[PDB]
RNA sequence: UGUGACC
């Protein structure tokens, strides 16, 4: 509830010269008071009359009404930022050392020195690409500095540490003035020219870093990173986070968690001695020297200190540095440089080929339907991303231009041009338009924006491999419904005094030109074997067209822009843009380690406890017959690196007996760690989401970081949200959304009023507002309807249908239509219409709901019904689980020490339902969890027509539709769909064991009725309420349920008429994918 | 229509 208040201290801070609180109430007479108070307030302000009287006069509204929004009327020239910044600029501005970076443009020169003219300029290399200004990030900081000016004791040491650092920014910024941004939140030439090219993005990186400073060690790390990061823009992060790969092999294991047969974490009190060959210490020092030579001082000592004893208890510092290294910003080079960096393989290609076979064998041998109708599968899965060229399109009586695949597939069909039989060339004659991938730390990488013919030809076969992966443990990233905790235990499992883990980063190998041949070759070779396993025209064709793209790509040409020119150079490496990218890379990376391990066995004899490939890393745990020694480690480590060398693969390969470090995670001292390097004030690229959407994503990013071990002051986060979600009515009148508006479970939710706890409307006003917002959730788009009606479209939707369905089916059909209408949202013009509407709507909205004939039910209502039939009473749970994830805040860790954690993802798509399994045996169609949710609630005879109308044979449709499974499915679909709506797999909850016995105790639910659905929700709602209470108070409570029998049937009905809510908060979570 | 693949 503090938002609404911290919101005023802010406005009254930014503006000095008025605020007009706007309330509302579900109660008619109180609302009319809410209306009167409003106007009376406007009036007095329109006369410079103190509102003090009215605030007393209408004290009733203040007290019993819900704050809807705070109106801010300010008449300043909005340069108050410039003015306000002086006070903090009394330190010596930083002077960029233009010597630290290789490429010249990476050095912090003046903009003009890099770009002499306005036609040569480009923010392309610094663009914060986010929808909030640098002025704001500035205002935010100062606002907070003022509020914690007179704080005492420790808060002061936090204020101080912070005030200091801000100066560095403030002073440096003041020297060249503050860079003003345009309506699109971009920094142009006129403003950037005189100022250092990287002033802005660095300011942003530095602000976000200093506002995440608390302890002295923080401050030390910030300050250091903030200074060097003003000159170094290319090796800092890599330099700072490089040591961590070795630090993990130095901490002894004193009690760890392993994985048991039930594939779940189980404590193991074992001790494993970290065995390290001297050479490693050399390597680690060489890394410490490099750290120093590049200016670093404070950070290198922290590690050197740590290295005396190397206590897993004093490892939180090392982890902290590793996570901070990333907040320096992204490394955005020039496409050209990004692209320029570019007989013993016999074994390595044989394995790749054998792996491509295993995966597709059965599907091929048994003329799988998916492999046959793969062309339809690709079409239905086609996204509305780029195709490469910017074609002119004819829709109805309108010719517009677009690059969208969905737009090009359509147009192409309506003109006999749709020809997937012909897989376009990608050579010198038809160069690949390029894309990029920017990440903090590593150098930029290019990306092939291949023609849609390439997706379609690969979609189905890729999916068939991913399935083989789903149940092959070696593929960590894909195995079962597993989260990272599982992979954590699979390693710590076989560890001991006679084994050694071998990890390897191979990101450089996959881009290496050496790989590109044995890679594409092994796949093709494999595809051949498969082709010889059938005669099915369908299979051979799609199996063949796959072989085709694996050739056109062998000798590929790329379109690198080199200025305002687009040179065509020859690309001889495997870039990524295909559908097989992730799968193939997984296949390849694993084929590799197998190749390496196989070779080193000629000398040393060991056993393979586990082999794994996960993203751009690949590791294995070997076991020897004798106790391992420093010398044994050195030898293995050498023969390995040497084996990799004989393949001309530039890769980092380490060998330890206690931990590992890979891009996704690292295991130090038997504990699990995940880098907390998600940037907040700078983004990789510009999407299409709105500001609100970005507000929510900021917050989301805050939560993930926080859980990972990097906390940005929440007061700062809330300030940014106050900024980003606002809506300007005129040049002076700006409207600010209230806490109720932004946190309630609506279509406009941005964040949770309290971290790790998701509330739902439990009061009338809350219900009122919730139902009001939903009413204006989806907006009209003239442009979207125009094409939604055009011929090529209807024909498109039609052609897809007649191809999928056998008999009639209106649910599918009505779906395919919308499913395709939505894709148009990637088209900017439409997107823009939408947002404009949403604003005006949500504009008048924050003024008077009322008229909204609610009739739709949501998870809120369901819960709000159940709420009153429970009795809480103080309970208690002892801490009985040792911590394995050190970084977790304290209130979230607690829940785990009491009820435990999980290593799987709760099924929330209805994929395990029998009916869904059925449809996938005879159909290429994929129904959402929300469709199955309705299809399962249909009259027995309707479900039978659905099934048949998708190619499901009667002996099957008729058999299922009756069976007991249909009933169990009925429950399973609902059970799955509800979890989906409660976000049981996100943020905080995904961590918890919702089936913990310890938890089950606190839940006392007398089953006065044998009606599964109701029993279900009652227990879950209770498990949630218990855990929330524990997440806030630190103590536990028990729940007793006295839900009526009569009511149960009333509820069960409500259950099957639930609507899914769509919001920025929701999408934010989906973005964490 | 300052936009730039897979997932
Ligand atoms: N290209 C690529 N991007 C990835 C990969 N894995 C994750 N990402 C990125 O992941 C960001 C998502 O971060 P998350 O995966 O949601 O962080 P998290 O993994 O959900 O934290 P949890 O897994 O507990 O463990 C996106 O912006 C992606 O670009 C990958 O293997 N390849």
CB atoms within 10 A of CB A1046: 8
> What does the block give as tokens for A940?
């027995």
Distance from C-alpha of A315 to C-alpha of A162, rounded to nearest angstrom:
24
- A1037-1041 and A870-874 as β-strands: parallel, antiparallel, unpaired? antiparallel
Residue A244: both structure tokens together: 């961590």
Give the residues after which the backbone of chain A is interrupted, taking a C-to-next-N distance over 2.5 angstroms as a break: 17, 342
Does the C-beta of A484 come closer than 6 Å to ligand 1?
Answer: yes
- DSSP-assigned states of every residue in A774-792: HHT-S---HHHHHHHHSHH
Burial class of A138 by CB neighbour count within 10 A (0 to 12, 13 to 18, 19+): buried
Q: Is A897 exposed, middle or buried (0-12, 13-18, 19+ CB in 10 A)?
A: middle
Check residue A316 and report its DSSP letter.
Answer: H
What is d(CA A1036, CA A967) in angstroms, rounded to the nearest whole number?
Answer: 36
Q: Which domains does chain A have, with CATH numbers?
A: 1-79+683-751+1060-1073 (no CATH), 80-232 (1.20.120.1390), 233-250+276-333 (1.10.10.1990), 251-275+476-505+581-682 (3.30.70.2480), 334-382+424-475+506-580 (1.10.357.80), 383-423+752-853 (no CATH), 854-906+993-1059 (3.30.230.140), 907-992 (1.20.120.1400)
C-alpha count within 13 angstroms, C-beta hemisphere, residue A1061: 27
Cα dist from A357 to A350, A366, A377, A532, whole Å: 11, 14, 21, 11
Q: How far is CA A257 from the centre of its chain?
A: 27
Q: Is A274 helix (H, G, I), strand (E, B) or coil?
A: coil
Query: How far from the centroid of its chain's Cα atoms is residue A363's Cα?
Result: 32
Three-state secondary structure call for residue A413 = helix
Which residues lie closer than 8 Å to A836 by C-beta, 6 or more apart?
Answer: none
Is the separation of the CB atoms in A433 and A388 below 8 Å?
yes
Q: Report how far residue A592's alpha carbon sits from residue A235's, in angstroms, rounded to the nearest whole number.
A: 28
Distance A705 CA to ligand 1 centre (A): 13
In chain A, how long is the greatest CA-to-CA distance?
A: 91
Contact present, A924 and A377 (Cβ < 8 Å): yes
Residue A623, classed as helix, strand or coil, is strand
- Do A447 and A437 form a contact (C-beta atoms < 8 A)? yes
Q: What are phi and psi of A600, to 5 degrees?
A: -70, -15
- What is each CA distance from A1036 to A686, A891, A1028, in whole angstroms? 44, 12, 9
What secondary structure letter does DSSP report for A871? Answer: E
User: Which residue's CA is the nearest one to ligand 1's atom 7?
Assistant: A1073
DSSP character for A533? T
Q: Residue A615: left if φ>0, alpha if ψ -120 to 50, beta else—which one?
A: left
Give the Cα separation of A448 and A516 in Å (integer).
15
Nucleotide nearest to A450 (CA to C1'): B5
Residue nearest to atom 16 of ligand 1 (CA): A1072
Residues recorded for chain A: 1073
Q: Quote the tokens at residue A229.
A: 């990061």
Which nucleotide lies closest to A390 by the C1' atom and the CA atom? B1
Q: Where are the beta strands (DSSP E) in A791-916?
A: 857-858, 870-874
Helices H / strands E in chain A, number of each: 46, 23
Chain B positions with an atom below 7 A of a protein C-beta are: 1-7
CB of A581 shorter than 6 A to ligand 1: no
| CA nearest to A335, candidates A509, A565, A142 | A565
Q: How was this structure determined?
A: X-ray
SS3 for A215-266 is: CHHHHHHHHHHHHHCCCCCCCHHHHHHCCHHHHCCCCCEEEEEEECCCCCEE
Resolution (A): 2.8
Q: How far is CA A922 from CA A366, A464, A875, in A?
A: 13, 15, 52
Cβ of A1033 below 6 Å from ligand 1: no
Q: Which residues have CB under 8 Å from A150's CB, separation 6+? A: none
Token readout for A844 is 């008048």
Using the CA of A399, which nucleotide's C1' is the nearest one?
B1
Q: Euclidean distance between the first and final Cα of chain A, in Å?
A: 30
Q: What CA–CA distance (Å, rounded) separates A418 from A394? A: 15
Residue A613 in contact with residue A490, Cβ under 8 Å?
Answer: no
Residue of the CA atom closest to atom 12 of ligand 1: A1072
Q: What are the backbone dihedrals phi and psi of residue A426, each rounded to the nearest 5 degrees, phi first? A: -135, 30
Distance from CA(A209) to C1'(B5), angstroms, rounded: 31
CA dihedral for A508, A509, A515, A521, sign (positive or negative): negative
Q: Is A12 in the pocket of ligand 1 (CB under 6 A)?
A: no
> In what helix (H) or strand (E) does residue A958 lie, and over which residues does it extend?
helix A954-960
Which residue's CA lies nearest to atom 22 of ligand 1?
A: A484
- Cα–ligand 1 centroid distance for A505 (angstroms): 17
Distance A131 CA to B2 C1' (A): 15
Q: Nearest C-alpha to atom 8 of ligand 1 is from which residue?
A: A1073
Distance, angstroms, CA A578 to C1' B6? Answer: 6
H or E segment to which residue A19 belongs: strand A19-24
């Amino acid at each position: 509830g503090k938002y609404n208040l911290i919101l005023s201290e802010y406005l009254s801070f930014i503006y000095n010269s008025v605020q007009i609180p706007i309330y509302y109430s579900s109660n008619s007479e109180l609302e009319n008071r809410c209306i009167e108070f409003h106007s009376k307030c406007l009036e007095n302000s329109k006369n410079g009359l103190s509102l003090r009287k009215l605030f007393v006069e209408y004290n009733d509204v203040i007290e019993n009404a819900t704050l809807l929004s705070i109106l801010s009327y300010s008449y300043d020239k909005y340069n108050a930022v410039e003015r306000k910044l002086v006070k903090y600029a009394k330190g010596k501005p930083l002077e960029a050392d233009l010597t630290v970076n290789e490429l010249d443009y990476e050095n912090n020169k003046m903009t003009s020195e890099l770009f002499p003219t306005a036609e040569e300029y480009t923010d392309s290399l610094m663009d914060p690409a986010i929808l909030t200004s640098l002025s704001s990030n500035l205002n935010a900081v100062m606002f907070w500095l003022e509020k914690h000016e007179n704080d005492v004791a420790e808060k002061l040491k936090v204020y101080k540490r912070r005030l200091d650092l801000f100066t560095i920014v403030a002073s440096t910024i003041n020297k060249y003035g503050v860079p003003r941004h345009n309506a699109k939140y971009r920094y142009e030439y006129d403003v950037m020219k005189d100022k250092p090219y990287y002033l802005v993005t660095w300011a942003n990186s530095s602000i976000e870093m200093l506002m995440s400073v608390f302890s002295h060690d923080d401050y030390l790390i910030a300050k250091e990173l903030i200074v060097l990061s003003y000159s170094n823009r290319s090796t800092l992060a890599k330099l700072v986070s490089s040591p961590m790969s070795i630090l993990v092999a130095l901490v002894d294991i004193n009690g760890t968690f392993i994985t048991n047969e039930e594939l779940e974490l189980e404590f193991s009190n074992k001790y494993v001695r970290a065995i390290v060959p001297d050479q490693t210490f050399d390597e680690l020092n060489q890394m410490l020297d490099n750290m120093r030579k590049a200016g670093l001082v404070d950070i290198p000592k922290m590690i050197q200190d740590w290295l005396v004893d190397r206590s897993i208890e004093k490892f939180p510092l090392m982890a902290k540095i590793y996570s901070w290294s990333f907040h320096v910003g992204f490394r955005k080079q020039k496409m050209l440089d990004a692209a320029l960096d570019q007989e013993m393989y016999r074994e390595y290609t044989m394995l790749i080929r054998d792996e491509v076979v295993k995966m597709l064998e059965e599907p091929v041998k048994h003329d799988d339907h998916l492999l046959r109708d793969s062309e339809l599968a690709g079409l239905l899965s086609m996204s509305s991303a780029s195709n490469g060229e910017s074609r002119q399109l004819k829709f109805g009586r309108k010719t517009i231009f677009s690059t969208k695949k969905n737009m090009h597939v359509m147009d192409d069909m309506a003109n006999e041009r749709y020809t997937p039989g012909i897989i376009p060339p990608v050579n010198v004659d038809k160069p690949i338009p390029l894309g990029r991938r920017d990440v903090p730390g590593r150098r930029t990488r290019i990306i092939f924006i291949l023609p849609y013919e390439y997706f379609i030809a690969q979609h189905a076969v890729v999916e068939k491999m991913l399935i083989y992966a789903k149940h092959t443990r070696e593929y960590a990233e894909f195995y079962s419904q597993s989260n990272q905790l599982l992979s954590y235990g699979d390693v710590t499992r076989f560890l001991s005094n006679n084994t050694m883990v071998l990890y390897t980063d191979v990101s450089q190998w996959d881009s290496s030109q050496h790989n590109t041949q044995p890679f594409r070759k092994g796949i093709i070779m494999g595809l051949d074997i498969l082709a010889n396993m059938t005669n099915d025209a369908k299979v051979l064709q799609t199996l063949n067209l796959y072989k085709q793209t694996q050739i056109n790509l062998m000798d590929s040409y790329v379109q690198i822009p080199d200025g305002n020119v687009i040179k065509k150079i020859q690309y001889g490496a495997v870039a990524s843009g295909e559908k097989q990218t992730k799968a193939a890379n997984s296949i390849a990376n694993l084929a590799l380690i197998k190749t390496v391990l196989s070779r080193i066995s000629n000398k040393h004899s060991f056993a393979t406890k586990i082999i794994r490939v996960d993203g751009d890393d690949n590791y294995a745990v070997l076991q020897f017959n004798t106790e391992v020694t420093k010398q044994m480690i050195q030898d293995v480590s050498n023969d390995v690196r040497e084996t990799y060398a004989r393949m001309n693969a530039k890769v980092k390969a380490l060998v330890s007996t206690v931990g590992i470090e890979i891009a996704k995670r690292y295991i130090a001292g038997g504990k699990i760690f995940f880098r907390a390097g998600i940037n907040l004030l700078n983004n990789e690229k510009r999407g299409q989401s709105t500001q609100w959407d970005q507000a929510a994503i900021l917050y989301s990013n805050y939560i993930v970081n926080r859980l990972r071990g990097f906390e940005t002051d929440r007061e700062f986060i809330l300030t940014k949200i106050m900024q980003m979600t606002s809506v300007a009515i005129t040049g002076s009148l700006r409207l600010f959304p209230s806490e109720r508006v932004l946190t309630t479970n609506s279509t406009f939710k941005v964040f949770d009023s309290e971290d790790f706890i998701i509330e739902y409307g439990t009061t009338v006003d809350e219900v009122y507002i919730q139902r009001a917002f939903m009413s204006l959730s989806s907006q009209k788009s003239g442009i979207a309807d125009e094409i939604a009606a055009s011929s090529t479209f209807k024909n498109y939707v039609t052609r897809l249908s007649e191809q999928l369905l056998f008999s009639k089916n209106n649910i599918v059909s009505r779906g395919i239509a919308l499913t395709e209408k939505a894709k148009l949202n990637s088209y900017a013009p439409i997107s823009l219409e939408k947002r404009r509407a949403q604003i005006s709507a949500l504009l008048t909205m924050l003024q008077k709901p009322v008229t909204f004939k609610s009739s739709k039910i949501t998870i809120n209502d369901i819960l709000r019904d159940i709420k009153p039939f429970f009795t809480v009473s103080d309970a208690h749970l002892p801490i009985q689980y040792q911590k394995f994830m050190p970084t977790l805040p304290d209130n979230v860790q607690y829940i785990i020490q009491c009820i435990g954690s999980r290593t799987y993802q709760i099924e929330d798509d209805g994929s395990k339902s029998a009916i869904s399994r059925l449809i996938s045996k005879y159909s290429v169609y994929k129904p959402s969890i929300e469709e199955l949710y309705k299809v399962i609630s249909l009259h027995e005879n309707e479900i039978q027509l659905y099934l048949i109308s998708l190619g499901i044979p009667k002996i099957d449709a008729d058999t299922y539709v009756g069976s007991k499974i249909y009933s169990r499915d009925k429950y399973r679909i609902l059970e799955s769909y509800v979890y989906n709506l409660l976000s049981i797999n996100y943020g905080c909850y995904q961590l918890f064991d919702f089936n913990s016995p310890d938890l089950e105790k606190l839940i006392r639910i007398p089953f006065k009725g044998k009606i599964p659905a109701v029993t279900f929700i009652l227990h879950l709602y209770a498990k949630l309420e218990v855990i929330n209470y524990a997440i806030k108070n630190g103590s536990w409570i028990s729940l007793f349920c006295n839900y009526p029998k009569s009511e149960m049937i009333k509820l069960w009905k409500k259950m099957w008429n639930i609507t899914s809510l769509r919001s920025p908060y929701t999408n934010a979570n989906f973005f964490q994918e």
